[PDB]
Curated annotation (Swiss-Prot), chains A, B:
Subcellular location: Early endosome membrane; Cytoplasm, Cytosol
Annotated protein name in UniProt: Sorting nexin-27
Purpose of the protein: Involved in the retrograde transport from endosome to plasma membrane, a trafficking pathway that promotes the recycling of internalized transmembrane proteins. Following internalization, endocytosed transmembrane proteins are delivered to early endosomes and recycled to the plasma membrane instead of being degraded in lysosomes.
Domain of life: Eukaryota
Portion of the full sequence shown: 39 to 133 of 539
Amino acid sequence: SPRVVRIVKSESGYGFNVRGQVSEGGQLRSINGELYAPLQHVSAVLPGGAADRAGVRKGDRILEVNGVNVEGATHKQVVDLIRAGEKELILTVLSVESESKV
Amino acid sequence: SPRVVRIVKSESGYGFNVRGQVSEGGQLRSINGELYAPLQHVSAVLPGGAADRAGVRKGDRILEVNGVNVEGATHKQVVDLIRAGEKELILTVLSVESESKV
């Protein structure tokens, strides 16, 4: 289920890489057993960076950026939204990797 | 725009799968808003393999293999070019997925 994560920008920026469609129009995909228009995803998280500390996970699919639903958005639209926040970022993500404390 | 990627072969080979026309002659296709004769594409990248580490992306369309333009080539022509290099591979690819560091 979609989860919300806050990241405060450090010196290394937010500390993650985003990957996804350069253009609009990709076909619908099945993510966590449900259909979405194409999502950008977290392709890497800088170990020790802000996103890692905040609990962003490699493979997280990005559903919202600072309250804006970015389902089927272009890569540039999403990265521009992230970069428009100069200190904080709120993501809603569909994680392909779960986490539990034991 | 076409980008260049180097991959050094590991134990798992280069660590990706190639898909594309078995025979020559497919019709021109529109890729990233431009016309090309049929391209082979990266259908999967082995997570943790050499291609993943080098930054090859699932969906990358293969424009050149070790300096050879393979626009409209057959699948076997392209795979033979890849395999003729026993340690290194240079690809020029048109990525359907962009990546940015934030």
